[PDB]
Structures are given as C-alpha cells and as structure tokens.
Amino acid sequence: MKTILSNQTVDIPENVDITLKGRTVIVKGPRGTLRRDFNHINVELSLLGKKKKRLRVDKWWGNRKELATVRTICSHVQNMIKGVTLGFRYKMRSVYAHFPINVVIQENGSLVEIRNFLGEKYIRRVRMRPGVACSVSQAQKDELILEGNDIELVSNSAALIQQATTVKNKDIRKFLDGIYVSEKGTVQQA
C-alpha cells in the first residue's frame, strides 16, 4: 500500500533559527551552528511559521520503509535543535577491579590516552571526532565528560573510548574492566 500523505511537524524554539537549502537543514542557535543534509531521503521540508517556527516533513506516496523515514528526519532535526541550544554531554565512568585506568587528556580535549587498562603496557590513543571535547570531571573520581553539539559525533567518540577499553581472551562477565557510558544528558540543564 502507498499512503497518500504522511507528515510530521517539529517546533523550533525562539532562540534558534532553521534555514532550508533543499533537503539541507542549517540549525543555528546560541551554542553554534549545525549542518545536515537529507538528500538520501525523498521528502519535502517546509518552514511554516514566522511566529512559532514550525518545520514540516511531508512524504507523498510512500510505502512502509520510506514512511519510516519521516520521524527519523524529525528526530534528527530535534537532536540538532537540542545540540545548538543545550548541547550534548556524555559521562563515562571507568570501572576496574585491580588496575586503575589512567586517562590523560591531550591537546584541547581532542585526544585521550588510556594507560593502565588491565595492567597492560600498551597505551591506547583515541582521537575524538571534530567538534567534540573530552575532559576529566572534578565532581567524580573515575569519570570522563564528553561535550559537543552533534549527538552523532559525541556518542561516536564515546563509543570509540568504550570499544578501545575492551578485554581480550577473558571471560567478560568476570573481567568487567573498561570505560562505559554512564549518563547521556545535556549541558546547561535547561
């Protein structure tokens, strides 16, 4: 079955403005700007409000699989709005039984050095995605903070660290050491 019309609307806050260039969305807010094109999805995007700033995604004559993309686009745009207004902050706790995992943060927070993971002498060097800043928290002991605007990049960097600290040739239900994402929140808490 081909549904005649499937549309979804997202609301844009006052402090953030959205510009459309075809299927390329530019979301500019107080924390910076974000670009993302959706040329891989055949939808129409329209800006409706001069007062309340609604963005509408319409898909005409779509089947099941391509009606599944309307809310995907809407959620991506909402994540863009969230990133440019509040930002994204992923906390990572480093857990270990015996050997403390020593994480040092190199230039501007874009490079992470894991030293003593499970007592190994190999030094893990993980480079964050551009626009992502890593730091060692002051409130908690074994905690890293990854902050950025693009949720894609922030969570990809968190996954890079988590998969860098991976146990080999051992029962992973017993050897639980590693750095794991503990919380996925925002910055500015608003």
Partner: protein, 139 residues
C-alpha cells in the same frame, strides 16, 4: 516544494492519448493512477484518465467532487479558463510549435531571409557594444 497538486477542480493539459492537446478538469480521484475527468468546454466528455498523460496547469476551479457536468461547465465559463489558458506562456509555446510545424517551403524561405537580416543587425549592434565597452582606461 510542490506548487501544483491533483485536486478537485485542477485543470490539466492532456499531453498524449486520444484527447491530446486539450484541457480538462479533475472531478474525482480513483486508485492513485486515474482520475474522473471532464472537459465540458474543451470537448472531452466525462471519463477516467490516467495521471501519466496529464500535465497540471496553474488553474483551479471551484466545484464539489463528482458534481455534474452542468456545474463543472459553469465553473469553467465563470473565470473562463479558455481565454486565461490562451494567454499563458505555455499555450503560446504550443501555438508556436504548431505553426512552425505547418510552415511551408515558401514560408521557410521567407523566414530564412528575415532571420538572416535580423541576425546581421543584432550582431552588428553586439560588435558595437563590445567595442564601446572595450574603451576602459580607469584606475
């Protein structure tokens, strides 16, 4: 992004098929491939028509769906689509194509002579403009 829609009252130009070259109005929609179609002032009786042979125009009439041909014709004559259509750039491009197709040998000869003179004058003026614009002595 879309500016023209299939809707009740939308006037469509039939591009091919038995009724090619005519205007119709969409009266109803069936099964996403066809429409009930009625051109009462363009000599197209009511019938089903695939959307593939339609090219939507910019005119939209106002009548309810599956209204009778009397009301479709009244809506067509009020705000007469025939004259409005003839005035559009689309219709006169069609007209130019038709009268170029029916050009005779003598008309082709006369067109060749007129085009010859027109192009020579235009290119002389073009050369004049280029030479005039080439006098640039400025900091």
């Amino acid at each position: 992004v879309f500016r023209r829609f299939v809707e009740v009252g939308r006037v469509a130009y039939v591009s091919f098929g038995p009724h090619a070259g005519k205007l119709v109005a969409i009266v109803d929609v069936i099964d996403q491939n066809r429409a009930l179609v009625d051109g009462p002032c363009t000599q197209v009786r009511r019938q089903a028509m695939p959307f593939k042979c339609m090219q939507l125009t910019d005119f939209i009439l106002k009548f309810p769906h599956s209204a009778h041909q009397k009301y479709v014709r009244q809506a067509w004559q009020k705000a007469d689509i025939n004259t409005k259509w003839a005035a559009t750039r689309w219709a006169k491009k069609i007209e130019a194509r038709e009268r170029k197709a029916k050009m005779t040998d003598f008309d082709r000869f006369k067109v060749m002579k007129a085009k010859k003179m027109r192009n020579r004058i235009i290119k002389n003026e073009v050369k004049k403009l280029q030479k005039a614009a080439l006098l640039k002595a400025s900091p």
